[PDB]
Paper text:
The human mitochondrial ribosome (mitoribosome) synthesizes 13 essential subunits of the oxidative phosphorylation (OXPHOS) system. The mitoribosome is composed of a small and a large ribosomal subunit (mtSSU and mtLSU, respectively), which each contain a ribosomal RNA (12S, 16S rRNA) and a number of mitoribosomal proteins (MRPs). Biogenesis of the large ribosomal subunit (LSU) in all translation systems proceeds through distinct steps in which the formation of the peptidyl transferase center (PTC), the active site of the ribosome, represents the last and most critical step and requires the assistance of assembly factors. In human mitochondria, the GTPases GTPBP5, GTPBP6, GTPBP7, and GTPBP10 mediate mtLSU maturation, as their deletion results in a loss of active mitoribosomes and stalls mtLSU biogenesis at distinct states.
For this, we reconstituted mtLSU maturation in vitro by complementing the biogenesis intermediates from GTPBP6-deficient cells with recombinant GTPBP6 in the presence of GTP and ATP. In addition, classification yielded a 2.6 Å reconstruction that lacks MTERF4-NSUN4 and GTPBP5 but shows a new density that corresponds to GTPBP6 in close proximity to the L12 stalk, which allowed us to build a molecular model. GTPBP6 contains a N-terminal nucleotide-binding domain (NTD), a PTC-binding linker domain, a GTPase domain and a C-terminal domain (CTD). Like GTPBP5, it binds above the PTC and primarily interacts with rRNA. The PTC-binding domain resides between h89 and h92, and inserts a loop (residues 241–255) deep into the PTC. The GTPase domain is located next to the NTD, on top of h89, and shows clear density for a bound GTP molecule, suggesting that GTP hydrolysis is not required for GTPBP6 binding. The PTC-binding loop of GTPBP6 occupies the same position as loop 1 of GTPBP5, between the P loop/h80 and the PTC loop and in vicinity to uL16m (residues 134–143), and causes rearrangements in the elements. In particular, the tip of the P loop/h80 (residues 2814–2819) refolds, which leads to elimination of a basepair between G2819 and U2813 and replacement of the latter by C2839 from h81. Binding of GTPBP6 also leads to movement of A3089 by replacing its interaction with F92 in GTPBP5 by a stacking interaction with Y241 in GTPBP6. Collectively, these rearrangements lead to a nearly mature PTC conformation.
Numbering used by the authors:
A (entry chain 0): 79 to 186
B (entry chain D): 61 to 277, 287 to 296
C (entry chain d): 38 to 56
The structure:
RNA sequence: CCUCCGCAUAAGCCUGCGUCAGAUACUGACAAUUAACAGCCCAAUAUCUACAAUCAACCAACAAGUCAUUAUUACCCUCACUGUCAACCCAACACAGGCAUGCUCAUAAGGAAAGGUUAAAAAAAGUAAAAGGAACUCGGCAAAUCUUACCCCGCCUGUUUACCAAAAACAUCACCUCUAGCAUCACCAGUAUUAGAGGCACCGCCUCACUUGUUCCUUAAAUAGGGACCUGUAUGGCUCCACGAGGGUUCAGCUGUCUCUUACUUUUAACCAGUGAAAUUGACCUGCCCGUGAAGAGGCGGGCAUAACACAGCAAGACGAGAAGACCCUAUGGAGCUUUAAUUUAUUAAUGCAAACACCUGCAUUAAAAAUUUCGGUUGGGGCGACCUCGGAGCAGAACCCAACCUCCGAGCAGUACAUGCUAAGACUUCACCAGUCAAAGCGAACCUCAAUUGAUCCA
RNA sequence: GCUAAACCUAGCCCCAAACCCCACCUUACUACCAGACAACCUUAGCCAAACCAUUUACAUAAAGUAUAGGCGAUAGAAAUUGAUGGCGCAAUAGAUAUAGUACCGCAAGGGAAAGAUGAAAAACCAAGCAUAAUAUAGCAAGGACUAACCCCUAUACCUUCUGCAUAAUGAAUUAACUAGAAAUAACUUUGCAAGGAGAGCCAAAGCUAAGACCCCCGAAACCAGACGAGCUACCUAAGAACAGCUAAAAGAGCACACCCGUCUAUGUAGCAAAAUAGUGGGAAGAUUUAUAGGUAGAGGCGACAAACCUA
């Protein structure tokens, strides 16, 4: 099947500017109370999630260095301790991941 | 084309010579004969058809010893390696020719008729009338050209004048100067005519290509004389 | 008979032009 | 999770995912592949070189087979050159195709079917299915199973229209017909048990087969299949052993073929993001019914209907897209093929006569081989049949003229005379021209019938 | 306001005048060994004759005359006479040309496109859209109207045809390019005039000169000369491959690689200008295949399918 006639620009505009095809305005956007960058109510803040992701990547690099090779997952819990922090009595008996930076305020 | 005949060797030898098939193609590269092509590779064995070829420095009638009788891929009749003096040569074997036999080749036309013995070569004038001959020459010294296929035998009918009448296997009659040499007996492999191919593959082995698929819709001649 | 028209290839430069 | 592969050599290509720097597997610069592997050879003159390979030993052969030197003379005093990369070649492409060889026979090597989501229809692939088991259908196609007994054709293995036909066609061993008495480029380094050109198709038996009707088996039912008998036609006819992706028939089984469809998975699909064609397209503000009409309307007439828009399906219409219809007819348009179509023998082969003392040349004749060209028209489409020119009568009643593959008659002469001589006003005219008609007067003489009863130019 | 638009000179056309280190024929562009092998030979056909067969063109004047000629289409003499640039193009034009390059094809061979500033760079307008989607109804317009629509009237165009809105052809649209050449005799206008004309020719008012006067694209074809057997048909040389099982020296059976392509489904601008999946035939032979060579179109080759010879 092939077009019997060329579709006019008027018809084409009627089709491609219909409200369905138009991009809908999103009303679920809000300001993240922590950093102030925009976020969607149901989605995590991109900026804060990036912070957490980069800190997690650093901690995981430290974990990999401590483990030293594949198939070396510890059988004991892990605790991340930053500069100026000493293992607590509760943290005793857990492998310590030492980060060469001060404790982040958001991380507790 | 660049076709050059493989028949370039100039010195007679016993060694099988490496042939080159033509496939029925002329030197121009075009097909001149149909139905020829392929087949088993063969080596040519130079056949000395001049049975009376006295060895260098030698002359007169001479005898030779049959070393072996061998199948020849290029001939219906099997050949024989016959050796005399200090030379060997391939010849056309006769029916009852065995290894170790003695074969006499002579040029003497005696007043009487030589006692014909199968396998020996004598001038046609010396043969008894009615003997079975083969490898007959058209002219004295030309070399055998007739009655050379398996089981073929000519008949010596008459010896009028200094000429001999030969009935060829096709029953045509031929006048040849009596001095021309012929060998007694019939050619070997007499049962060649009763050979059953059995399969088209055997013809292809022998080198005969299949016929074209396209569909298509007497007194004995006079005697041929060479005198 | 069998009627076949071979495809016609357009010159390559037309589609190989660059800025 | 896959492993078709993969690694090398050959062939091919020619720097085509190495480093750096830039942009917006690209651009510029830089670097690289190192000979032992491979290529690139040989001083002459003669002269040697019968005895395969197959574990080569037995055996077994037929298709009869790649592998060898000596004699004399010259001659050592010298390790260059070239390929070496890659994700690669031929297919317009990072193309599901093609691509020789050695090893690996599933890999130690090489790879990723899913961009994300949902789980609509339709579509593709797959799995499963109650009871039934071909009732589907042209046909058991496909699928599932492993499954008998036949018939036709072809003997068989093979070959074929690359890209719609794989066959009953072509070939084929075997048999048969014809031609040929011979050597230095095929046939053939051969010689009648040979070679070539053919026909048909193994072998075996003969020199009965097919058609007209009646009937039997097979099914519940048969224009299907098989088997009989009965009437006439017509040394190449019968005979199926084996074989066949050949064409029909069939038992049993099998099964989604079907009664009668359903469920699920993958792809596809729909939505989101990136990239982004093709045919088509007069303009379209692009409704239904009836009627009309260039003989079938969205657009015309009379009615009815009617806010505007997307998205997904459907295929009734847009005489839908696609290919200036392959069918049919026409064209004083082609081409292929066949000929006892026309015209030729330039070319070969023979002869014969010349010329010369068999060959060559010239001229004729006969064949083979070919070559050039054509294959009328009317026509109730075309073909077949009939017809094609001329005159009389109706149609066409009365000046003239009127078609018909309309109705009827006829003609292609005959006869009589030899002024059936010559000239010349004026007229007619078959709707043109050509052609065909009549004719006063005059000279010269005596004192043409018939409707058609025919034909130009050129050329003889 | 984006795509874009324009531009002037790169050059070209017609005339005049004038005559114009090394390597490389072997596999070209390869330093360096016994050659011998060397070229002349009527064009044909299309086309016209409305077919086609003999035939058909390749200074002025005499003259389109003598002649030739299926005496027809047409062909056609000789004696004799005397013989300094552009009312061109200007980037779809003009050379094909920025180049015989890129690209395409094995080869012969085919064959393009295009650029635009300024003295110095060491300084508004085609189509298509967007601004700005759309309102009942209809060849989209016209008559109008206060009012865009609503009202009434109106069956796109071209070609072809007896007759087309036709559901007959062409066209998506914009820009550019793209198609009537000429004699005889007439007619009009001049000059001169029984003469005209700048030799020839015409003339019983003619003659000289001028004005006016006849298209584009398209076949299947035919012939000549080249190029092609890296595909395919066959052949030549020397090579290679064919597991395993049954049988036994087999154009044997089953069945890998390999070759082929029976049937079905998908695909049909496809992965593919013939493929994919399954299924299937052969798979020690008349097998398959790599390499180099050969047969070339009045031809080759062909187990004839009028097969194949670079889709
Ligand atoms: N018609 C024409 N005249 C030309 C052509 N070339 C040159 N001329 C003329 O030749 C004459 C001389 O040309 P110039 O260039 O002035 O001089 P030149 O170099 O001595 O001339 P030539 O000798 O012709 O080379 C002038 O009248 C030019 O117009 C040409 O192609 N055609
Ligand atoms: Mg035949
Ligand atoms: Mg392709
Ligand atoms: Mg993937
Ligand atoms: Mg997806
Ligand atoms: Mg079931
Ligand atoms: Mg049924
Ligand atoms: Mg059944
Ligand atoms: Mg039914
Ligand atoms: Mg099946
Ligand atoms: Mg068969
Ligand atoms: Mg077969
Ligand atoms: Mg073949
Ligand atoms: Mg086919
Ligand atoms: Mg084939
Ligand atoms: Mg087929
Ligand atoms: Mg046959
Ligand atoms: Mg049935
Ligand atoms: Mg998208
Ligand atoms: Mg209607
Ligand atoms: Mg829709
Ligand atoms: Mg559909
Ligand atoms: Mg319409
Ligand atoms: Mg259509
Ligand atoms: Mg047409
Ligand atoms: Mg036809
Ligand atoms: Mg014609
Ligand atoms: Mg008249
Ligand atoms: Mg003509
Ligand atoms: Mg014409
Ligand atoms: Mg002259
Ligand atoms: Mg140009
Ligand atoms: Mg505009
Ligand atoms: Mg129309
Ligand atoms: Mg038409
Ligand atoms: Mg159209
Ligand atoms: Mg080849
Ligand atoms: Mg095997
Ligand atoms: Mg076999
Ligand atoms: Mg045929
Ligand atoms: Mg045919
Ligand atoms: Zn935040």
């Amino acid at each position: 099947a092939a077009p019997k006639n060329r579709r006019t620009i008027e018809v084409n505009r009627c089709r491609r500017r219909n409200p369905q095809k138009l991009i809908k305005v999103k009303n679920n956007i809000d300001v993240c109370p922590e950093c102030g960058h925009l976020k969607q109510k149901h989605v995590l803040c991109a900026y804060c999630y990036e912070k957490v992701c980069k800190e997690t990547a650093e901690i995981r690099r430290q974990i990999g260095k401590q483990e030293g090779g594949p198939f070396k997952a510890p059988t004991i819990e892990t605790v991340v301790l930053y500069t100026g922090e000493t293992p607590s009595e509760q943290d005793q008996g857990k492998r310590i991941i030492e980060r060469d930076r001060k404790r982040p305020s958001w991380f507790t | 084309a660049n076709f050059v005949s493989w028949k370039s060797r100039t010195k007679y030898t016993i060694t099988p010579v490496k042939m080159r098939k033509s496939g029925g193609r002329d030197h121009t590269g075009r097909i001149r004969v149909h139905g020829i092509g392929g087949g088993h590779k063969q080596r040519y064995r130079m056949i000395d058809f001049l049975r009376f070829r006295p060895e260098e420095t030698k002359s007169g009638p001479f005898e030779e010893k049959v070393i072996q009788v061998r199948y020849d891929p290029c001939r219906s009749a099997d050949i024989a390696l016959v050796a005399g003096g200090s030379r060997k040569r391939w010849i056309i074997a006769t029916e009852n020719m065995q290894a170790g036999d003695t074969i006499l080749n002579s040029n003497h036309i005696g007043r009487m008729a030589v006692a014909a013995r199968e396998g020996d070569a004598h001038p046609l004038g010396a043969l008894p009338v009615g003997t079975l001959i083969n490898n007959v020459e058209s002219e004295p010294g030309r070399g055998a050209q007739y009655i050379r296929a398996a089981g073929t035998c000519g008949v010596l009918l008459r010896k009028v004048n200094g000429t001999a009448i030969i009935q060829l296997p096709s029953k045509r009659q031929m006048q040849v100067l009596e001095t021309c040499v012929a060998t007694v007996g019939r050619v070997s492999n007499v049962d060649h005519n009763k050979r059953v191919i059995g399969k088209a593959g055997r013809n292809r082995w022998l080198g005969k290509r299949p016929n074209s698929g396209r569909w298509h819709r007497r007194p004995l001649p006079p005697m041929k004389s060479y005198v | 008979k069998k009627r076949f028209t071979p495809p016609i290839y357009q010159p390559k430069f037309k589609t190989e032009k660059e800025f």
